[PDB]
Write a protein that binds this ligand. Structure first.
Ligand SMILES: *[C@@H]1O[C@H](CO)[C@@H](O)[C@H](O)[C@H]1NC(C)=O
Length: 59
């Protein structure tokens, strides 16, 4: 699969996995920070120390 994003805090980067999100190593996309339904993903390897996310346009 290929999760690429463009607009989040990555200024145009490909989401990566696994990605620590608030001490929550997520090896995929998650909608815990959304209130609609889609799912986003971190673009860094340490969200707790990076603060960079993106979207997960995929299935
Ligand atoms: C998440 O993975 C990183 C890389 O191995 C590790 O340093 C960190 O402690 C892990 N955190 C959790 C909650 O598993």
């Amino acid at each position: 699969v290929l999760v690429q994003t463009r607009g989040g805090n990555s200024n145009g980067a490909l989401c990566h996995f696994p990605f620590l999100y608030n001490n929550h190593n997520y090896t995929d996309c998650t909608s815990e920070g959304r209130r609609d339904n889609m799912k986003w993903c971190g673009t860094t390897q340490n969200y707790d120390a990076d603060q960079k996310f993106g979207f997960c346009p995929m299935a």
